[PDB]
Design a protein around this ligand. Sequence first.
Ligand SMILES: [Mn+2]
Ligand SMILES: [Mn+2]
Lengths: 165, 295, 295, 302, 929
Amino acid sequence: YNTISITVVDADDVGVNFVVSKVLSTLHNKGIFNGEVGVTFPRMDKNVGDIITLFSKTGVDRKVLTSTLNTLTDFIHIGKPKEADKVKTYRKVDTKSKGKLIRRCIKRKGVSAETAESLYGNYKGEKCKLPYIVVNSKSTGQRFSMFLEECENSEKFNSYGLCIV
Amino acid sequence: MQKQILTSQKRNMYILSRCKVLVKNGQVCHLHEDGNVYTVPYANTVFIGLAEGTSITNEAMSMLAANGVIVFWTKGGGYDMFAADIICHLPQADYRPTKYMQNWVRLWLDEEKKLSAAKEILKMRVDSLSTHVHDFGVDVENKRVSSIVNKFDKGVTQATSFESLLGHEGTFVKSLYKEYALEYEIEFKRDHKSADNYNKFLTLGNYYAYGIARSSLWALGIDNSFPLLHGSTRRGGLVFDVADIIKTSIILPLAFHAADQGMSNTEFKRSCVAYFDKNDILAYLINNIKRLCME
Amino acid sequence: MQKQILTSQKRNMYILSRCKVLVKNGQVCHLHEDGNVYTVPYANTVFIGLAEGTSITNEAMSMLAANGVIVFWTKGGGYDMFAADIICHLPQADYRPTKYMQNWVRLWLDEEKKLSAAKEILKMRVDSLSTHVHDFGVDVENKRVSSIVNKFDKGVTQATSFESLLGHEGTFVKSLYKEYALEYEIEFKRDHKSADNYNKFLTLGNYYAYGIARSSLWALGIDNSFPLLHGSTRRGGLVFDVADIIKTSIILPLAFHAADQGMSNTEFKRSCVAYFDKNDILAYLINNIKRLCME
Amino acid sequence: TKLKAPAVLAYSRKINPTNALMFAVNWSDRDNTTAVMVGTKTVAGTQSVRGNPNDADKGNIQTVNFANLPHNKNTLLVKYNVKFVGDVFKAELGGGEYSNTLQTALENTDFGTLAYRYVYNIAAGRTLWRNRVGAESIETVITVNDQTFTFSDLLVNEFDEDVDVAEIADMVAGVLSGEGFVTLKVEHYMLLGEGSEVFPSQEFVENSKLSKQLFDLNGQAAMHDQKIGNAIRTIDTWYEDATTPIAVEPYGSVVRNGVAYRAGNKTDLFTLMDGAVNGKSLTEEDQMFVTANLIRGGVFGG
Amino acid sequence: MFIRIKCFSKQPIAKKVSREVSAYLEYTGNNTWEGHISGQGVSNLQTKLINVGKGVKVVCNYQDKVLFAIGNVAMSDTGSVPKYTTKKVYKPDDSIFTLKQGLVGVAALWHDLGKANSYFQRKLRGECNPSDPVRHEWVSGVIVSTFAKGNDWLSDDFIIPEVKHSDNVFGDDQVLNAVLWLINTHHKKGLVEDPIYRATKTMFTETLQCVNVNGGWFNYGDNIDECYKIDTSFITDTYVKQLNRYRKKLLATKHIWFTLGEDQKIAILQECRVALMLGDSNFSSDLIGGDGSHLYANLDECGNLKQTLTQHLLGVTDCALKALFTINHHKPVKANFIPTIAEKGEGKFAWQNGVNMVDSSIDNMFCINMASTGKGKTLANLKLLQHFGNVRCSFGLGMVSLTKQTAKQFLDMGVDYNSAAMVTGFSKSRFNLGSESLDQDEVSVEYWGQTSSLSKVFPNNNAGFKNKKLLSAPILVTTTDHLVKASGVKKGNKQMLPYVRCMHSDLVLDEIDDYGIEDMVVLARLVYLTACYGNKVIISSATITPAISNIFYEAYSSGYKVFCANKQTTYKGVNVVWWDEFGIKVEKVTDQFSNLNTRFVNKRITNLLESTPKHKALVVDQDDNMEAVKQSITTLHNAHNSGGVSFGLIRTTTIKDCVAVTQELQNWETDLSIKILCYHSRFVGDTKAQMEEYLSKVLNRKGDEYKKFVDTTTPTAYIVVATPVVEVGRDFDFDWAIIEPSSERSIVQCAGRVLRHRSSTPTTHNIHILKYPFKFYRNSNICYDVAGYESKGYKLKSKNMLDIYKKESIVNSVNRLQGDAAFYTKSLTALEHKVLLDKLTTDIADTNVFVGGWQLTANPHEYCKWRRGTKNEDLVLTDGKWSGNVTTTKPIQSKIWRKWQGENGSITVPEYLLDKTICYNDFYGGYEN
DNA sequence: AGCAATTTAAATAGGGAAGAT
DNA sequence: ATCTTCCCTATTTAAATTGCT
Ligand SMILES: [Mn+2]
Ligand SMILES: [Mn+2]
């Protein structure tokens, strides 16, 4: 599948990962990831890396995405579209912490608050140490951290560039 | 085999490989690998080169030098010359240094022409970048590369001293290194001691650039002891200064393409000499040095 | 890599005749038509001249130039009467020290500094005479040689031009040629085309001092296109200017002794190695040309 | 010779910016300035510290600040006054056996370029670190001695030529080379979008404390004066291996990258001022760097 | 330089060396090259002729002397190039080589019999403590002793009997006792704590009977019964026949063992032990792979079971036999014939023609080079070594920097790295700055050299860089601690490499007086061991005391007695070569060394005394030494100065004394322009090195180059307050010195730091000796023990230097050269000589120099410790941040002339001063505040 | 003890072919 | 062509043994 590169440059004044996350947000908000364009990162060791890599099967051109990232052009670099027979596809993994599932136990099982604390008191509290990005969510008005990890390649992708199922 | 290199306008730097050069029936010929003899016309060549697998004889040497055809010994490829004599005005009638050589000396001496020629060598280095456009490399007309080019142009034009020009030259060279690293998805930092593909491929490509710049400086009789940017104690600094023109325009994209596809060194050598033969890079350096020294 | 021997500390010098020079198992060796392959100490060779009937491959030049051996050919303009173009390839692949070019050309361009440098190199003739004495020929301290050295110094002190210099050369050399000839009881006319030993040994020593002078020049980076002596009969450049320091002190006494004591060409050649390494003439010329450029 | 540097030698700060107060406007309704309020949301979570494992059962009710634009204004306005002051060669604590030699060694400083890069860092948006990111429109208005200057498209990384920055740079270099002061009221209007989250400067919190303090003057979000002063002097493109302009430091040191560019390679300020008072020939760029440090100021004693 | 190279080689190793030797010389035909080349060309030809591979057979002749000989080519004994050399040349009553072969073979087949107990099996498998209660060498010794008590141990079937715990395994049979000591001490020597035994035991068996299990073998002792229940699975074919053939070899040769002397037995058993550890470590290093199970000896890196004990014993036997053969039948690789040595010395080196008075064919030589400093002592030592032929020597010197100085002299005169090997085993970070290309200095560690044939018998092909430089060096310019381990070690196989090094190489020890008393004892032990194999000892010390020169001669004489009776040759005596800058004297001395040595000493004294007095010392009368230092500085500046500028050296004793003198002089109000330096040893890597290079370049007074390293325009007192680090190995030249008295050799050495380079005589006085050491105010009972030979057993009756020294005296080496034992309680010189003869005596004691009987034990390596210092922990400065309790402080900034800063490095603090903060400072390093 | 005959074998030289530049 | 590596190719040296005087 042919692919394109979006490398964050000159982001020292601002962290590199903040520019990476803003690149993800601007690629989300102006379309791009309809259902078939996916992201991958060549340098996840402990950081998310500074290269966004889009491996759309139909083909991503330079002009559409450089018009999309007109806001990041001061510290971005776009390579010409190259080809890759295999891309290392990542997916979204989310975390739950206490009250999250407590409200689920309010609205699914219909139990009271104290017994919902009782079934979950000694449980939960997982801690994801995977490399991540920090995403502005616009439909739900709060900003969060989204965790990415390696999984088998899927035909369909989300609106963010990660695998489905 | 037989190889033609245009150098100035009409004289041709002949390169002969796997052949035995001697005198047959009163004129210089050479037996090739296929057992077929080939003669050489004295009128159209001034530089004749002896690549790998090549032997020349004494009366062939004498008759070649008596016809104005001055011979040099080179490593196979034609741009890695290790042995020659010095160009004169005429080979037989007199012994004077070439006008180009004398002009270079005078320009180097007076401090103002040396500064103006240092600015000019960097102007033509930016020209070289645009002139020699590659396919696999980055776009020279791209906005980041053009911003680097205009930054270098402003910095060279506004500078009044050599150490400012050295800082600006290093900024431009390593900025193009950073741009090509941003292309080829790698953390590239220029060090000669590294054993990775990009650094060692750039190192041996730089050695090829030094060889072709040495041939271009020799072919107009320019000596190897008058550097423009580099210091007076730098041995062969003019070879490095002339090779700087094509290090970041030709050697750098070819070397990064070679490390990207990962092929071996001899076929990188054949790619470098193919780019030198196709676009007449030595002729570009010859005309560059003529325009620098003539002023 | 090591120090790879200083080129002043190389002692072997050769002028090969009627042979095919090649590389056989990494060896610089010349093969004759009788099937004899004689090796050459290429890491210790000062120069290899090539006489008529000689031939050399590429690889032999490649590992002679990497070891800093100057290779010239005795034909072409090698008839020594015009002395226009003795075809002399140098190893410029090694990037030479530059400062001797800088001080040399600072004094070259300045014509008054060139005139003074010419006078110093003309005084080096009599300096060579005094330093290098011979015990089988002319005593330097006798009345004729002391008188002509005094006349030469008092003429070169009051000299005004290079035309006046050309004339003082006529006197010194011609009359030293003659003074030896009268003491060796031989009517002698210097002729490069003459068949007598007194001239063939002199031309062989001319080629030997050519090789020593050119190796001393190249060592410092000095070329040949910057001579100090300009004249009608002084075609040949700086290598003959350095070489005629040691005609009448070294080359001429050895050639006259050889001819008188019936030496063969081979032993005269060897007598030349013995005098050029016992008194260390290459380091003498190299240090003295450092004294010449200096500032 | 051997003019040894005074141990009390210091220079005053010559680029004094105010705190960058932050307001919410529209793009075509630029006069209605509503102050951006730092909200603060509570987060429930137990404490996890290395020194107190016994206290991890209960506690640490933390309340972390945030600052967004309101949902009716799409433009963030940043107001601050940058005050350039002259006589940068006067040492305030130093003296004049060394500082007077510095005066007479840095008199050939081209202040034009120094000032250009200062006003270019003012105008292009170097003072707007994380909130110029992702903005579809950048605007800078500079008011100086009853003169208004408008800047729209200036790429901040390279200092390209525009006659507007140059115009102000003239009076700024005339101040910095001579005696006096000049004040640039800088208002930045960046169109981020409707309700986009803005970035004030951060107070230092402890390893524990709370997650993040945003900088408040009288309840309103702002950014630090020294942080803007970091932005203005971010002009250093003259160290060896200079890729991007860094803040002019006496050691060329950036904390956030974990490397120092001018330390340990004879291009630090101190070796250059000792070379200046011992009188070796400086180039224009390192002398400009030394004058930029003296404009920045700081104690140089040892 | 005209050389001729001939090739003896077979193979195409007559072909691929021909390319390199035909790159540098002309071909004269018949595999012979001949021509002219430079000395650097000789070095390049050596470097690319040796590196080309193994089997190079090259002989080079410069004129007619052999330049070099690649390989073990016999080449020339008289003529050069032999005909065919086949076999069976001499075949003598070798006797002692058959004795060493029998002892090593019998012991090596019995050295690891004690690993067969069940405790060692579960130790290798790993279910118990890896430290045994009793070490397996002692268990194997118990096995052999029980077998010898039961059956006739020399001619019987083996069968391992039921053994119990034995406190002692040493009986009376001298040969059995030799085999038992070889078995038990194949890992470590036994250590005897007993004071009466240490007082009295001298003989071979009579000391060996006191070596019990409690001397290190008996670790804890709770599983002894499991440690002595043993299986007998060794009874196989090849093990039994190997044991039988070696036992019968010993049986046939042990008749010459009783005809040996004590000295022989000790040296022969030391050689046997060294060969036994060589074979044991050689077989333990390599992995053999195959095993017959049920019993095991060693473990691999993965801990798996390997090297079963039958084939382990067989492999250790053959490797030790081969070790012995190559160390006893080696023609070792010697250095090049340096052509810049053999010519005449001119002027002040004209005494170096004394080598033309020495015989070139002597098998042994004991040089006592009493020449003064600045005369080229080490060059004269190399000349004396090269007078006997090609050079093979170990230049063992104190300090790293003195080895660097001798290496730089060897480099710039004639010696390349194909013959020289500078060894400093610490990898110091002192680099040369300014210009790497324009250095022409900083002798480094490469050693192109030539690998000797002895590397194949060492463990895992010797080692990497360091031990290859140790063993294979023709000339080994080394720090001395790489050679004093030849005499023996506590634990491990660190004895074998300097032992085999000093076996085939000469020993050259320069300025042995700067070493400690125990250091000099173990150095004379090394001299005895070097003389045990016929090598020549060159001692080079000007201020030699008769006692020292005598005990070094007696060590060499006992060693040459070992070597003479070892080759069954009648002992004619030792060729003693007395040498100084005024003459030489070579005598065959077998007895009356003392009168000849004192006559040479008196002749050197009379050749020193009619020369002009260069150091006139006045002992001050001022009691308080602080103001004595003040008044002496004022007086010697007003008398000794070069146009107002004077250089003074305040030699004090210890570090806090140095900072006390510095802090007094900095606060001292005077019209003199005092500029103070601190020059002690407690300093950080950077700071210390910087002081060294500066001081060496400002106190160089052979030329006027220093006028540019200091401000000589203004009249200034440049004062350097230093500890004994200035009086050892420093080429410094002060105008005058003020000395705190600690020892008389300190007085002579600090006289040697004044007018060292000039020849102008002083007029009035150039040395002012302090009235008392500063320890008098801290300890009036004993004050000269710090950096001196006063001690608790040798106390001066008075500490006044008017009582114990001359008030006006010309200080030279004469007082140290003469030697006086009477009146040692009220004079410093006789106190010095007393200690020197009362510690380095001709006895064996236990910490003495003739040590016999104790070499078998671990006692001379425990109670006589080389470089015996205090605990010494190292506070390390890491990038400006100190490690321990350091606390950087600020100096007085009154008169400091030069102060170099430091960021890295380490300071050596005694554990006593670790209690408090050492308070490191940039000017003066360590103190008490 | 030197040698001779005579075997035995290790190695040296060379020519042809093929693969590199 | 040039030069290198390797495989024949057998030609060419060195050792080894042993009656014989
Ligand atoms: Mn063991
Ligand atoms: Mn063992």
